Short mmCIF file of C-alpha atoms and ligand atoms in Angstrom, two decimals:
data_model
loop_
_atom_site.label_atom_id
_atom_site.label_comp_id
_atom_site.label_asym_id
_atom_site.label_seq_id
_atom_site.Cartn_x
_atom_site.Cartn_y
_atom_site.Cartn_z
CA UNK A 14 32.78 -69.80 -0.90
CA UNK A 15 29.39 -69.78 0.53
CA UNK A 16 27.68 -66.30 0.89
CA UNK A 17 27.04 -64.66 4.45
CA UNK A 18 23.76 -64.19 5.67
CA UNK A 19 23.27 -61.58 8.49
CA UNK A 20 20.48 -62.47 10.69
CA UNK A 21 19.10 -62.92 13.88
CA UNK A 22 15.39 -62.88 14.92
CA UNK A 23 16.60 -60.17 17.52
CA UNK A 24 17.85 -57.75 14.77
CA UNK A 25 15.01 -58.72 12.18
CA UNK A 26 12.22 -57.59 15.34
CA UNK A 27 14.74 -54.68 16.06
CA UNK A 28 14.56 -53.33 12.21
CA UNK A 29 10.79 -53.49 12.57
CA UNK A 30 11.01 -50.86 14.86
CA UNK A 31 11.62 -48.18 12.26
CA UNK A 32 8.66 -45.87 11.81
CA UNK A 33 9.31 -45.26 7.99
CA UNK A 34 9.10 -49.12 7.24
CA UNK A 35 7.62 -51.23 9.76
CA UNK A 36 7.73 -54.74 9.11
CA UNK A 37 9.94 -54.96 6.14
CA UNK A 38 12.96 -56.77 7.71
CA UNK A 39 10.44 -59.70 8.66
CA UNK A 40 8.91 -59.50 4.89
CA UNK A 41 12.06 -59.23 3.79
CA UNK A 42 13.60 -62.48 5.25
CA UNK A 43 10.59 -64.32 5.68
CA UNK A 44 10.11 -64.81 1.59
CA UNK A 45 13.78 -65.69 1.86
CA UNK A 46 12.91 -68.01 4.34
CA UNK A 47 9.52 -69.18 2.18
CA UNK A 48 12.30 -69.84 -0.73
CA UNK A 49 14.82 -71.95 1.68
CA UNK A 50 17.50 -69.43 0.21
CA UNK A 51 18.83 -69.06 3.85
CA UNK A 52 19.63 -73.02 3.97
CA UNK A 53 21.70 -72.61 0.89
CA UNK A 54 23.67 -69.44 3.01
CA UNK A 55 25.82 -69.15 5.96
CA UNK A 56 23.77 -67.29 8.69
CA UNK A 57 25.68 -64.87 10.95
CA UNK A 58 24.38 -63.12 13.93
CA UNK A 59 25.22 -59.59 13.88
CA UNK A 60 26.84 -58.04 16.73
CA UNK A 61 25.59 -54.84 18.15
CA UNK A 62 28.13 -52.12 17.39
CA UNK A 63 29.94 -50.79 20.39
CA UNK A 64 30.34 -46.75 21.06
CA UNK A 65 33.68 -46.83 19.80
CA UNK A 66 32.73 -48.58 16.55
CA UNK A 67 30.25 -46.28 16.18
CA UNK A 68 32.65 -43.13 16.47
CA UNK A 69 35.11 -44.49 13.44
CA UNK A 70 32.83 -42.46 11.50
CA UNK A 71 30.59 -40.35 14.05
CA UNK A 72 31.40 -38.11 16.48
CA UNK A 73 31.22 -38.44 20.25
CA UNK A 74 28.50 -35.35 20.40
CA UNK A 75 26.21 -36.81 18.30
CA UNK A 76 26.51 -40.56 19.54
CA UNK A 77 26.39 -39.25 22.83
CA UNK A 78 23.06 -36.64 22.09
CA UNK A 79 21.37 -39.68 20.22
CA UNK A 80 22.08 -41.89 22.89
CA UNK A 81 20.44 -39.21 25.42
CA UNK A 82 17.60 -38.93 23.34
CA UNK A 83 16.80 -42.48 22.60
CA UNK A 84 17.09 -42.95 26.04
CA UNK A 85 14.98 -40.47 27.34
CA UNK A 86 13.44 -38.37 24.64
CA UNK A 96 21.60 -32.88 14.70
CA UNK A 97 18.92 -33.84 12.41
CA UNK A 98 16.79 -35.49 14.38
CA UNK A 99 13.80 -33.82 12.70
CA UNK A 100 10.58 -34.66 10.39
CA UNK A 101 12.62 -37.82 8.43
CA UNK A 102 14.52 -38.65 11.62
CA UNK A 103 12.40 -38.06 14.58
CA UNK A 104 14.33 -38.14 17.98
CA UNK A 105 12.18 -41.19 18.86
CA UNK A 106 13.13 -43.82 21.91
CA UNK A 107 15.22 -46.67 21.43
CA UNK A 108 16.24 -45.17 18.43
CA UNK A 109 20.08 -45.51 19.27
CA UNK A 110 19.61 -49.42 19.86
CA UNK A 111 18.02 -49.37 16.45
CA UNK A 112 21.35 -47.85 15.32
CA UNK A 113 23.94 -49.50 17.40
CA UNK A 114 22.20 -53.32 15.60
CA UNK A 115 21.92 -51.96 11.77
CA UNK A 116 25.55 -50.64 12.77
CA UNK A 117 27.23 -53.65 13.79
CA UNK A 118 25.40 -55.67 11.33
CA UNK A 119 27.45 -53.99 8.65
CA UNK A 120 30.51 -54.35 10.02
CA UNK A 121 29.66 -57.91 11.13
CA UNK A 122 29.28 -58.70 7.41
CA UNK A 123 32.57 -56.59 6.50
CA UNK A 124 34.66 -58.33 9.48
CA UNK A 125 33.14 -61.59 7.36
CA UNK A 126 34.52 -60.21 4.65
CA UNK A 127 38.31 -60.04 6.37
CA UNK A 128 38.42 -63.40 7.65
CA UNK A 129 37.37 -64.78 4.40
CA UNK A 130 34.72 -66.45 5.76
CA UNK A 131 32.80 -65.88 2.38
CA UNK A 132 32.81 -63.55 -0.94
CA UNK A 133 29.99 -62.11 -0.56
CA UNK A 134 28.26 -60.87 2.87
CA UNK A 135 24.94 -59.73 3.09
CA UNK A 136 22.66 -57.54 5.09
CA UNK A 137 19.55 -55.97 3.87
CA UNK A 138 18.56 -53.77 6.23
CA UNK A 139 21.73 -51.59 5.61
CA UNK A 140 22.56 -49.38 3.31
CA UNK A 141 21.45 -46.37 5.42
CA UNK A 142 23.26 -43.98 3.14
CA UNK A 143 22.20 -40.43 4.12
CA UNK A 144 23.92 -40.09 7.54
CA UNK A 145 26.95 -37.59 8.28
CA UNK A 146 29.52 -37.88 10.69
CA UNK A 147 27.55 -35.49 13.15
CA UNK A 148 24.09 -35.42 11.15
CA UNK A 149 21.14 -37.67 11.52
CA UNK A 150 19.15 -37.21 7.61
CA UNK A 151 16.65 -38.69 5.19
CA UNK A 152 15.10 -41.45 7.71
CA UNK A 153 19.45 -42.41 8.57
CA UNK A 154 20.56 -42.14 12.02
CA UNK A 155 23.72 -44.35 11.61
CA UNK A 156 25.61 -44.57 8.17
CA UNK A 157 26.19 -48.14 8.73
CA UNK A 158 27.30 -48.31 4.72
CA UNK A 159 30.73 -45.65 5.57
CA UNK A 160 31.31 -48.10 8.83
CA UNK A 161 31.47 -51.12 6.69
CA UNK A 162 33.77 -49.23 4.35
CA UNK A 163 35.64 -48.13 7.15
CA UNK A 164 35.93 -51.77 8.77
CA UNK A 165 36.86 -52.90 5.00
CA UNK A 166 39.80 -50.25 4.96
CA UNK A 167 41.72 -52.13 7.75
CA UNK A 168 42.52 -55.02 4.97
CA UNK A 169 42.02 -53.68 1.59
CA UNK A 170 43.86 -50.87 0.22
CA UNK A 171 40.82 -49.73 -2.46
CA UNK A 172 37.62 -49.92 -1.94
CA UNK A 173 34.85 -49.36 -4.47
CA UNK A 174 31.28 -48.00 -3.08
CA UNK A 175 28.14 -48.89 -5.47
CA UNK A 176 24.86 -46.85 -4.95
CA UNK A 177 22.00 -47.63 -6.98
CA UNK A 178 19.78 -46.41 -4.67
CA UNK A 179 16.67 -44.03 -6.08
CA UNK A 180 18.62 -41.29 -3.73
CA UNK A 181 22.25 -39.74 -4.17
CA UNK A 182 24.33 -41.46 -1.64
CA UNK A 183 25.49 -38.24 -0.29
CA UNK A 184 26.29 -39.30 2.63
CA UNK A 185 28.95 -42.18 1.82
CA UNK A 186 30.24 -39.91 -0.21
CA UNK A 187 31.22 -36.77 1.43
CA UNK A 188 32.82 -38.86 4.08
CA UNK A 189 35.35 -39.97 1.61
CA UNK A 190 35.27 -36.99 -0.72
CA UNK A 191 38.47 -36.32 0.44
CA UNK A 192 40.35 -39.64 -0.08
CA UNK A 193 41.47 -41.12 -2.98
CA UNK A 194 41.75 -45.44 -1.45
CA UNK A 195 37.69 -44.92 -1.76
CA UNK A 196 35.95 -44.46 -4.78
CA UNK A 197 32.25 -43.64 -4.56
CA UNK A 198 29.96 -44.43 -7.32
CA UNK A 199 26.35 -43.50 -7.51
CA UNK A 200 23.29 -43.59 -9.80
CA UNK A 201 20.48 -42.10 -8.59
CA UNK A 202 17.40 -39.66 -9.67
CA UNK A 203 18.48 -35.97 -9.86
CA UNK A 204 15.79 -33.16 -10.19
CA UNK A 205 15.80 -29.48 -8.58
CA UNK A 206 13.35 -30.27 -5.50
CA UNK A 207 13.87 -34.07 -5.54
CA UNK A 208 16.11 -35.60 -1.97
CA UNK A 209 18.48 -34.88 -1.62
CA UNK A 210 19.36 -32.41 -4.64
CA UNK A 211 23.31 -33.28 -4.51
CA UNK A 212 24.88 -35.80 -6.76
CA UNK A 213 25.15 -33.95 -10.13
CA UNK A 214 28.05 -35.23 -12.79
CA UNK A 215 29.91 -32.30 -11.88
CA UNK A 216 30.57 -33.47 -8.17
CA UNK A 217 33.79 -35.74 -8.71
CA UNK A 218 35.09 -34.99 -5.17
CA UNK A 219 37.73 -32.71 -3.00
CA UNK A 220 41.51 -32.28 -2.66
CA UNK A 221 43.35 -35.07 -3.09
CA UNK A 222 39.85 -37.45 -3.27
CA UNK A 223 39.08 -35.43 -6.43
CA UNK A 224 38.15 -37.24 -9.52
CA UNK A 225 37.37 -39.84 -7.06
CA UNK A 226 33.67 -39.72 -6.57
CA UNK A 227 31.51 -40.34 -9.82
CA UNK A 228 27.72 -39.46 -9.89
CA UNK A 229 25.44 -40.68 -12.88
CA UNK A 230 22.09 -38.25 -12.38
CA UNK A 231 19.21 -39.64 -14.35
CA UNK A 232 15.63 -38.71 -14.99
CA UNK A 233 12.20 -40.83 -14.27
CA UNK A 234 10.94 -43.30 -16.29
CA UNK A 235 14.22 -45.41 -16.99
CA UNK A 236 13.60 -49.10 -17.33
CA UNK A 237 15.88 -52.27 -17.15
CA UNK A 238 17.47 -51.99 -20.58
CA UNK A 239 19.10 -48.83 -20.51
CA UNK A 240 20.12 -48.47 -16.87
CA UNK A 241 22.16 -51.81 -17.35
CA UNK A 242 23.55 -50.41 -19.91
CA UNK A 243 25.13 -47.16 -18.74
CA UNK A 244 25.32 -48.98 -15.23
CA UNK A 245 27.52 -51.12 -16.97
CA UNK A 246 29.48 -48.63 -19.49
CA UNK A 247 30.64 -46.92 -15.69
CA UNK A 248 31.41 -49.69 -13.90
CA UNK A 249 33.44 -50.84 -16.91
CA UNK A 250 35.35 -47.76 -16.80
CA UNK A 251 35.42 -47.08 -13.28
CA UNK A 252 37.05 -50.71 -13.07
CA UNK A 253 39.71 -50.65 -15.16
CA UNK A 254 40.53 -47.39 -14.14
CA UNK A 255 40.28 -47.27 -9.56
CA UNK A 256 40.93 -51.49 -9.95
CA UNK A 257 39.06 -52.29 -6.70
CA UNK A 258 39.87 -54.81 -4.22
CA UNK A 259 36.58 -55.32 -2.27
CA UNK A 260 32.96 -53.75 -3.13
CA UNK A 261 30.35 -52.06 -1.10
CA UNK A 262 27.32 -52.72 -2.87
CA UNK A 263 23.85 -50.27 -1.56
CA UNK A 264 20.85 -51.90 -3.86
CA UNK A 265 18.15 -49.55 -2.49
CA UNK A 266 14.32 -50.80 -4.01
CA UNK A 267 13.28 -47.79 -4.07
CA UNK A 268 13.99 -47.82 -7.89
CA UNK A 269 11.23 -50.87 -8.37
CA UNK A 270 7.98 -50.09 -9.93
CA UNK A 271 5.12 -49.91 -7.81
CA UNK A 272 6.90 -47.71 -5.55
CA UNK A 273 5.23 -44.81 -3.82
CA UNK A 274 8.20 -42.90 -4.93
CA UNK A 275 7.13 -43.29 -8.20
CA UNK A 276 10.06 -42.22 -9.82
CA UNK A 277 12.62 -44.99 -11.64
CA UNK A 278 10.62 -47.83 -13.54
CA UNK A 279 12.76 -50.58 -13.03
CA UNK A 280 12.37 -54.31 -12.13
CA UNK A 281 14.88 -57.27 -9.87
CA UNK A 282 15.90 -58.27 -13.02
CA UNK A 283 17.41 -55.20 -14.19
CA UNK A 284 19.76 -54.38 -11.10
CA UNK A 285 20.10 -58.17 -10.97
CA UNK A 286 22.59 -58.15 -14.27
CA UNK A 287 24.13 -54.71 -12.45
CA UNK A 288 24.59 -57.13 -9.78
CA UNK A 289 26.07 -60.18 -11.67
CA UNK A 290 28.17 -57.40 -13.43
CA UNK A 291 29.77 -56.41 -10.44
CA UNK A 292 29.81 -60.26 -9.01
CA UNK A 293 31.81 -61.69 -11.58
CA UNK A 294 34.94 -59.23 -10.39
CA UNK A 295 35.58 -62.12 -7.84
CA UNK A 296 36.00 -59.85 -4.95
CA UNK A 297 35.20 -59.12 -1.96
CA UNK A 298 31.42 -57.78 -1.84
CA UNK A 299 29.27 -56.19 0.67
CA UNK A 300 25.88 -56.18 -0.24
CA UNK A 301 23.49 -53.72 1.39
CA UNK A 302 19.81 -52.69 1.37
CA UNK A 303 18.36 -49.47 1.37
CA UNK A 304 15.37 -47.70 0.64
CA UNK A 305 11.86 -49.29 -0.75
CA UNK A 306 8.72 -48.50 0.15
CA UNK A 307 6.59 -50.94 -1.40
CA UNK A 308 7.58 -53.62 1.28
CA UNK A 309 5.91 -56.64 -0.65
CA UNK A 310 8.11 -55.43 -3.54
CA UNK A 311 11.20 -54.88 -1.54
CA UNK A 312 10.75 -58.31 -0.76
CA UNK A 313 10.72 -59.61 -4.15
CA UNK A 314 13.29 -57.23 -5.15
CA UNK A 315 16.04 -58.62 -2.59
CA UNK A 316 14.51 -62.26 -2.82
CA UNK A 317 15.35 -62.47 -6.72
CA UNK A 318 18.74 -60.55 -5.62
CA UNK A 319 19.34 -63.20 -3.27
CA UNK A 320 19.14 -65.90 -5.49
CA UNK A 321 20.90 -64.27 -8.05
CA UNK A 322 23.67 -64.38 -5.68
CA UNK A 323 23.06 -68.09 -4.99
CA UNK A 324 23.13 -68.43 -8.49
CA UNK A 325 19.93 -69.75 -8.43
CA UNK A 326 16.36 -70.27 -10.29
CA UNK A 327 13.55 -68.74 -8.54
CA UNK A 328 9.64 -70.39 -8.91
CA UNK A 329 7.45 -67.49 -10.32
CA UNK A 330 4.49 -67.89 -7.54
CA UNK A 331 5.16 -66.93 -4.34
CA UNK A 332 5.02 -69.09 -2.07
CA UNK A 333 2.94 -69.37 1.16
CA UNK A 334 4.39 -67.78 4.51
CA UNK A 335 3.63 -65.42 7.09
CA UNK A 336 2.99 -62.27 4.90
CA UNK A 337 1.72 -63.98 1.83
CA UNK A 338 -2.16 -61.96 1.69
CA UNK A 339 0.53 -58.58 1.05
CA UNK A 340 1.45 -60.39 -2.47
CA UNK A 341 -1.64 -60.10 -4.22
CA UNK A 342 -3.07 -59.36 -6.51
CA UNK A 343 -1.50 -62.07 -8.72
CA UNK A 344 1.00 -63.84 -6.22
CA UNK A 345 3.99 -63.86 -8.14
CA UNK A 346 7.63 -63.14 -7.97
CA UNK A 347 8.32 -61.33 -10.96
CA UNK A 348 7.20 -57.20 -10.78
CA UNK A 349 5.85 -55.41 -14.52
CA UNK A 350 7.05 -51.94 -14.96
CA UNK A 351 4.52 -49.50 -15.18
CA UNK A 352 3.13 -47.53 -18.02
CA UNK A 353 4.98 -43.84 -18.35
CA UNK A 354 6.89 -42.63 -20.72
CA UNK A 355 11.41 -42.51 -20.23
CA UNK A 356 12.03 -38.50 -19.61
CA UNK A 357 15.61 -39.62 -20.54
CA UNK A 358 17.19 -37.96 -23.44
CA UNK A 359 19.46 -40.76 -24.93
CA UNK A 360 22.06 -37.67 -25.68
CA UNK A 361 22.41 -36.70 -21.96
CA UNK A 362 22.96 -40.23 -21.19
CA UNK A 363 25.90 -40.30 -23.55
CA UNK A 364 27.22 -36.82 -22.11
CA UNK A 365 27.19 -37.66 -18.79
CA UNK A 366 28.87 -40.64 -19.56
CA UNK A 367 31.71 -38.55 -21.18
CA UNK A 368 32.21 -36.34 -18.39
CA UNK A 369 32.50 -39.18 -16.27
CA UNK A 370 35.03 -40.90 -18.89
CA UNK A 371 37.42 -37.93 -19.08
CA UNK A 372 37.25 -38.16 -14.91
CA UNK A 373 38.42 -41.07 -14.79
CA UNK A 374 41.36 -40.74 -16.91
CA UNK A 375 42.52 -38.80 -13.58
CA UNK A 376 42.82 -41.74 -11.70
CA UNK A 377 45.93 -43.16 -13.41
CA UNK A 378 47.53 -43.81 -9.82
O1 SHH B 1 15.28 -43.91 0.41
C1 SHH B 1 15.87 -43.05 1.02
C2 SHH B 1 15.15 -42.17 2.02
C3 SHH B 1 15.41 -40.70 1.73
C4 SHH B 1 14.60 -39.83 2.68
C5 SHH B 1 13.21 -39.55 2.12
C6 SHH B 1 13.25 -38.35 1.19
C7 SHH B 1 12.32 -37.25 1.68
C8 SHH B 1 10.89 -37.70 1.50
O2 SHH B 1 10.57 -38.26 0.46
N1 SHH B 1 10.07 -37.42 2.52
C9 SHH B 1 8.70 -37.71 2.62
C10 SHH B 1 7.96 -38.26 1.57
C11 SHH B 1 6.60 -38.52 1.72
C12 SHH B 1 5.97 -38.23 2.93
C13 SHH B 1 6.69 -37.68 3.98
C14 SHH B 1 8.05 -37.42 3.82
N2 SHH B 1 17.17 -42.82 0.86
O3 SHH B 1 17.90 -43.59 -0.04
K1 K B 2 22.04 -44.12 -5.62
K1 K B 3 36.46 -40.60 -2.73
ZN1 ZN B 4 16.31 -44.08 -1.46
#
């Protein structure tokens, strides 16, 4: 009944390596580690995934092309540059995932954790948006082996497009996402009207929302889905992506949102009693990321967190005022309170599909 906690100081160093975020694995667990959360967990070190783990969910060309590259020098592009070692980096995010969902099986805990997953942009044969490895659609697939339904969260800034297209066209995985949707904004998919293909239709839901929205009304119609979506796909494990790329104070600059506000999306979903994957994602204000999955972990832990932060390794990134808690920034909600309700409607009637 104690949570998993996937880490090693091999697989921390390894998610270092990453270009687009360097450093914010060790930032990441080291305020952890400044809160003694990790004493209060049960630490797991991840396995590296093996090639045929890997190819559950990617194919053999592009394992074997990344592989080539990495080793020497499909995607690999501006957000996913064909840099060395880069399949290594993979292969450890990879089999940290389905570390925590083989955690998950044995019943070794109720919730399993690793924050540098969530990597939720990757195809099957398609490296995109700074994902090489869809580590979030292996732990799904791992989960799959046990549990018969399987419900995907994604409150990631970005559409989990990814996740979902690989089971767009199964109905024992629903897919639900929340994330900003704008013509011109990454990755442009993921409006209401995308429920899914063939017989996996009705079972994708996307909630597109616009910038600006704060704690109190993305709990809300975070929880007005999640309500429906539960009674109606009744789930028996969760994959949970809690991307910080929503915080404010993000570069992105898009969502206004603070811990505590995905924290009761969080409890929401913890108090179903099942089995729950928890994944990170994007967030690229690493001293906020931090925070973000700090308070998250303790939320978990069911735990009170002190407001100042306390002294460790990275604690000069913290300032100016040293403390925990993050205040949402000063621009207006471009959310129309009747397109909430709409899209919420839409999704409603979708659901009353999945009577099976
Ligand atoms: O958080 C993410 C990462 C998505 C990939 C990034 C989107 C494209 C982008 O914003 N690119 C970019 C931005 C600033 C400077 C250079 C590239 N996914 O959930
Ligand atoms: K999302
Ligand atoms: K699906
Ligand atoms: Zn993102």
């Amino acid at each position: 009944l104690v949570p998993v906690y996937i880490y090693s100081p091999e697989y921390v160093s390894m998610c270092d390596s990453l270009a687009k975020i360097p450093k914010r694995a060790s930032m990441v667990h080291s305020l952890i580690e400044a809160y003694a959360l990790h004493k209060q967990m049960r630490i797991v070190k991840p396995k590296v995934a093996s090639m045929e783990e890997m190819a559950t969910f990617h194919t053999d060309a592009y394992l074997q092309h990344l592989q080539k590259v990495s080793q020497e020098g499909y995607g690999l592009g501006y957000d996913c540059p064909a840099t060395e070692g880069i399949f290594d980096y993979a292969a450890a995010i990879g089999g940290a995932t389905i570390t925590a969902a083989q955690c998950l099986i044995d019943g070794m805990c109720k919730v399993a954790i690793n924050w540098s997953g969530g990597w939720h942009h990757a195809k099957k044969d398609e490296a995109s948006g700074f994902c090489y490895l869809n580590d979030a659609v292996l732990g799904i697939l791992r989960l799959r082996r046990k549990f018969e339904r399987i419900l995907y969260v994604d409150l990631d800034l970005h559409h989990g497009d990814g996740v979902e297209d690989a089971f767009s066209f199964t109905s024992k995985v629903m897919t639900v996402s929340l994330h900003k949707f704008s013509p011109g904004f990454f990755p442009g998919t993921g409006d209401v009207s995308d429920v899914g293909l063939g017989k996996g239709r009705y079972y994708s839901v996307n909630v597109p929302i616009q910038d600006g929205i704060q704690d109190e009304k993305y709990y809300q119609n975070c929880e007005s889905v999640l309500k429906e979506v539960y009674q109606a796909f009744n789930p028996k494990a969760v994959v949970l992506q809690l991307g910080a790329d929503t915080i404010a104070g993000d570069p992105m600059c898009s969502f206004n949102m603070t811990p505590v506000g995905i924290g009761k999306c969080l409890k929401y979903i913890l108090q179903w009693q099942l089995a729950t994957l928890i994944l990170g994602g994007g967030g690229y204000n690493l001293a906020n990321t931090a925070r973000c999955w700090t308070y998250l972990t303790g939320v978990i832990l069911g735990k009170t967190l002190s407001s100042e932060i306390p002294d460790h390794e990275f604690f000069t990134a913290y300032g100016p005022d040293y403390v925990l808690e993050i205040t949402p920034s000063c621009r207006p909600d471009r959310n129309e309170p009747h397109r909430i309700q709409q899209i919420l409607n839409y999704i409603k009637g979708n659901l009353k599909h999945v009577v099976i």
